[PDB]
Amino acid sequence: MDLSTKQKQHLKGLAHPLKPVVLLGSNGLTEGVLAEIEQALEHHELIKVKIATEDRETKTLIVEAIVRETGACNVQVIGKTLVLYRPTKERKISLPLE
């Protein structure tokens, strides 16, 4: 999911105060962690996923795969924390509309 900068900046601000709800280990993007990311997105829409790897390229590939498989938007990668957003029918999270 691709959102505008405006949209991402808004989401980044709502995210500051959140603590991560999923830790993705150095073993990588397994089906089990993918399923947990799905549940977290369904429950909160905007979440923080801590990614264990220290290797930039690897972190990148993992993030790209999460985006493609889940349809969520990569709001921003901050250090080891990936901020992801995907709406649910309930629309829990706010957003500027374009």
The secondary-structure class comes to alpha+beta
End-to-end Cα distance, whole Å, is 14 Å
How many separate structural domains? Answer: 1
What's the shape? globular
At the fold tier of CATH, the topology name is Translation Initiation Factor IF3
* Major β-sheet strand ordering: 1-2-4-3
Query: Can you count the beta strands?
Result: 4
Q: What is the CATH homologous superfamily assignment?
A: YhbY-like
Determine and state the CATH class: Alpha Beta
Estimate what percentage of residues fall within beta strands.
15-25%
Largest sheet composition: 4 strands, mixed
State the order of secondary-structure elements, H for helix, E for strand.
Answer: HEHEHEE
Pfam families: CRS1_YhbY
Protein name: RNA-binding protein YhbY
Keywords: RNA-binding
Organism: Escherichia coli O157:H7
Structural commentary:
By secondary structure, the chain is an alpha+beta fold. The protein has one domain (1-98): Translation Initiation Factor IF3, CATH 3.30.110.60. The chain has 3 helices and 4 strands, in the order H-E-H-E-H-E-E. It has helices spanning 5-15, 31-44, 56-70, and strands at 22-24, 46-51, 73-78, 81-85. The protein has a 4-stranded mixed sheet, with helices on both faces. Strand 3 (73-78) and strand 4 (81-85) form a beta hairpin.
